[PDB]
Scaffold this active site. Structure first.
Site, PDB file in Angstrom:
ATOM      1  N   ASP A   1       0.725  -1.439   0.014  1.00 11.77           N
ATOM      2  CA  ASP A   1       0.071   0.016  -0.020  1.00 11.77           C
ATOM      3  C   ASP A   1       0.634   1.331  -0.002  1.00 11.77           C
ATOM      4  O   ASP A   1       1.431   1.502   0.988  1.00 11.77           O
ATOM      5  CB  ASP A   1      -0.928  -0.029   1.124  1.00 11.77           C
ATOM      6  CG  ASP A   1      -1.737   1.152   1.218  1.00 11.77           C
ATOM      7  OD1 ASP A   1      -2.044   1.977   0.259  1.00 11.77           O
ATOM      8  OD2 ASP A   1      -2.631   1.201   2.391  1.00 11.77           O
ATOM      9  N   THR A   2       0.841   2.047  -1.006  1.00 11.25           N
ATOM     10  CA  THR A   2       1.571   3.276  -1.348  1.00 11.25           C
ATOM     11  C   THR A   2       0.849   4.388  -0.582  1.00 11.25           C
ATOM     12  O   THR A   2       1.594   5.569  -0.375  1.00 11.25           O
ATOM     13  CB  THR A   2       1.694   3.691  -2.742  1.00 11.25           C
ATOM     14  OG1 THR A   2       0.454   3.762  -3.271  1.00 11.25           O
ATOM     15  CG2 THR A   2       2.441   2.575  -3.520  1.00 11.25           C
ATOM     16  N   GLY A   3      -0.358   4.223  -0.011  1.00  7.89           N
ATOM     17  CA  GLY A   3      -1.286   5.398   0.609  1.00  7.89           C
ATOM     18  C   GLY A   3      -1.009   5.502   1.999  1.00  7.89           C
ATOM     19  O   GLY A   3      -1.460   6.162   2.718  1.00  7.89           O
TER      20      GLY A   3
HETATM   21  C1  LIG Z   1      -3.103   1.741   7.491  1.00 12.46           C
HETATM   22  C2  LIG Z   1      -2.867   3.240   7.910  1.00 12.46           C
HETATM   23  C3  LIG Z   1      -1.230   3.440   8.251  1.00 12.46           C
HETATM   24  C4  LIG Z   1      -3.519   3.505   9.235  1.00 12.46           C
HETATM   25  N1  LIG Z   1      -2.925   4.232   6.719  1.00 12.46           N
HETATM   26  C5  LIG Z   1      -4.480   4.451   6.169  1.00 12.46           C
HETATM   27  O1  LIG Z   1      -5.365   3.830   6.382  1.00 12.46           O
HETATM   28  C6  LIG Z   1      -4.342   5.665   5.130  1.00 12.46           C
HETATM   29  C7  LIG Z   1      -4.999   6.599   5.807  1.00 12.46           C
HETATM   30  C8  LIG Z   1      -4.932   7.973   4.829  1.00 12.46           C
HETATM   31  C9  LIG Z   1      -5.695   9.194   5.466  1.00 12.46           C
HETATM   32  C10 LIG Z   1      -7.112   8.961   5.352  1.00 12.46           C
HETATM   33  C11 LIG Z   1      -7.618   8.578   4.213  1.00 12.46           C
HETATM   34  C12 LIG Z   1      -7.282   7.398   3.532  1.00 12.46           C
HETATM   35  C13 LIG Z   1      -5.523   7.398   3.396  1.00 12.46           C
HETATM   36  C14 LIG Z   1      -4.826   6.376   2.794  1.00 12.46           C
HETATM   37  N2  LIG Z   1      -4.849   5.174   3.835  1.00 12.46           N
HETATM   38  C15 LIG Z   1      -4.345   3.969   3.223  1.00 12.46           C
HETATM   39  C16 LIG Z   1      -5.347   3.139   2.332  1.00 12.46           C
HETATM   40  O2  LIG Z   1      -4.736   2.528   1.197  1.00 12.46           O
HETATM   41  C17 LIG Z   1      -6.277   2.208   2.965  1.00 12.46           C
HETATM   42  C18 LIG Z   1      -5.488   0.964   3.601  1.00 12.46           C
HETATM   43  C19 LIG Z   1      -6.419  -0.171   4.008  1.00 12.46           C
HETATM   44  C20 LIG Z   1      -6.860  -1.170   3.191  1.00 12.46           C
HETATM   45  C21 LIG Z   1      -7.804  -1.963   3.606  1.00 12.46           C
HETATM   46  C22 LIG Z   1      -8.191  -2.131   5.009  1.00 12.46           C
HETATM   47  C23 LIG Z   1      -7.924  -0.915   5.652  1.00 12.46           C
HETATM   48  C24 LIG Z   1      -6.811   0.001   5.143  1.00 12.46           C
HETATM   49  N3  LIG Z   1      -7.353   1.897   1.979  1.00 12.46           N
HETATM   50  C25 LIG Z   1      -8.658   2.095   2.306  1.00 12.46           C
HETATM   51  O3  LIG Z   1      -8.886   2.854   3.433  1.00 12.46           O
HETATM   52  C26 LIG Z   1      -9.642   1.848   1.372  1.00 12.46           C
HETATM   53  C27 LIG Z   1     -10.629   2.883   1.102  1.00 12.46           C
HETATM   54  C28 LIG Z   1     -11.477   2.692  -0.097  1.00 12.46           C
HETATM   55  N4  LIG Z   1     -12.753   2.261  -0.137  1.00 12.46           N
HETATM   56  O4  LIG Z   1     -11.205   2.603  -1.491  1.00 12.46           O
HETATM   57  N5  LIG Z   1     -10.279   0.740   1.743  1.00 12.46           N
HETATM   58  C29 LIG Z   1     -10.234  -0.593   1.151  1.00 12.46           C
HETATM   59  O5  LIG Z   1      -9.853  -0.680  -0.019  1.00 12.46           O
HETATM   60  C30 LIG Z   1     -10.872  -1.771   1.728  1.00 12.46           C
HETATM   61  C31 LIG Z   1     -10.923  -3.007   1.119  1.00 12.46           C
HETATM   62  C32 LIG Z   1     -11.434  -3.862   1.658  1.00 12.46           C
HETATM   63  C33 LIG Z   1     -12.087  -3.787   3.187  1.00 12.46           C
HETATM   64  C34 LIG Z   1     -12.878  -4.929   3.750  1.00 12.46           C
HETATM   65  C35 LIG Z   1     -13.542  -4.818   4.792  1.00 12.46           C
HETATM   66  C36 LIG Z   1     -13.329  -3.254   5.617  1.00 12.46           C
HETATM   67  C37 LIG Z   1     -12.758  -2.229   4.842  1.00 12.46           C
HETATM   68  C38 LIG Z   1     -12.095  -2.558   3.685  1.00 12.46           C
HETATM   69  N6  LIG Z   1     -11.420  -1.434   2.821  1.00 12.46           N
END
Ligand SMILES: CC(C)(C)NC(=O)[C@@H]1C[C@@H]2CCCC[C@@H]2CN1C[C@@H](O)[C@H](Cc1ccccc1)NC(=O)[C@H](CC(N)=O)NC(=O)c1ccc2ccccc2n1
Lengths: 99, 99
Positions: B25-27
């Site tokens: 995850d690059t984000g």
């Molecule tokens: C992991 C952590 C270090 C806390 N970072 C982050 O979460 C940062 C926070 C940043 C500021 C707020 C807005 C989002 C950005 C990017 N994110 C990264 C970002 O890549 C994050 C990683 C992730 C993936 C899956 C589950 C949880 C977390 N993805 C997401 O938040 C994306 C949002 C979306 N609907 O497209 N979620 C999903 O792609 C996704 C996929 C399957 C799932 C199944 C069950 C519950 C949740 C699920 N969410």
């Protein structure tokens, strides 16, 4: 171009006649943008991530230019602290992960 | 390798002497893994995602093999939907975004 990950991969995007900064997010299934008043029909949706779920509005077929590359697809608008460009649009501009 | 994004970028990782699947995850700034026992002392911490904040356990200098590549850094453990390999570790293995 090639983007290193020493810093957050932020790029300029163009949507609805507006320039914004967005995060290239390989870990996001969808594209989620900060609250903005776009015209057109939308359907309510719930998306989740680390701390839970949020309510967002789903707009389809929205033209979007990412770092100079054209794309068109679904964008979700809601209370997110940052604009996120997910895989649905990354695949369109031929983005890949390499190591 | 070169990874396209039509599907979630999941890879196998080896940590604490065990195998698990994780998302490149690059984000994400940090690496967050599902609840599990890891040797060493941990420090309480909080991190925020989309949806809100959660309480995690921080383990430092944890060796982790990602798709055959070695990395050693900070790993956060807590209630996450999936295992996420963030930029702190992605940079160590020389990962970049290209398009
Ligand atoms: C992991 C952590 C270090 C806390 N970072 C982050 O979460 C940062 C926070 C940043 C500021 C707020 C807005 C989002 C950005 C990017 N994110 C990264 C970002 O890549 C994050 C990683 C992730 C993936 C899956 C589950 C949880 C977390 N993805 C997401 O938040 C994306 C949002 C979306 N609907 O497209 N979620 C999903 O792609 C996704 C996929 C399957 C799932 C199944 C069950 C519950 C949740 C699920 N969410």
């Amino acid at each position: 171009p090639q983007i290193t990950l020493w810093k957050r991969p932020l790029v300029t995007i163009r949507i609805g006649g507006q320039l914004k900064e967005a995060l290239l997010d390989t870990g996001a299934d969808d594209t989620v943008l900060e609250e903005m008043n776009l015209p057109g029909k939308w359907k309510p949706k719930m998306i989740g991530g680390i701390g839970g779920f949020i309510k967002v509005r789903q707009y389809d077929q929205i033209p979007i230019e990412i770092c100079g590359h054209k794309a068109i697809g679904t964008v979700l608008v809601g209370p997110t602290p940052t604009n996120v460009i997910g895989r649905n649009l990354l695949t369109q501009i031929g983005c890949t992960l390499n190591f």
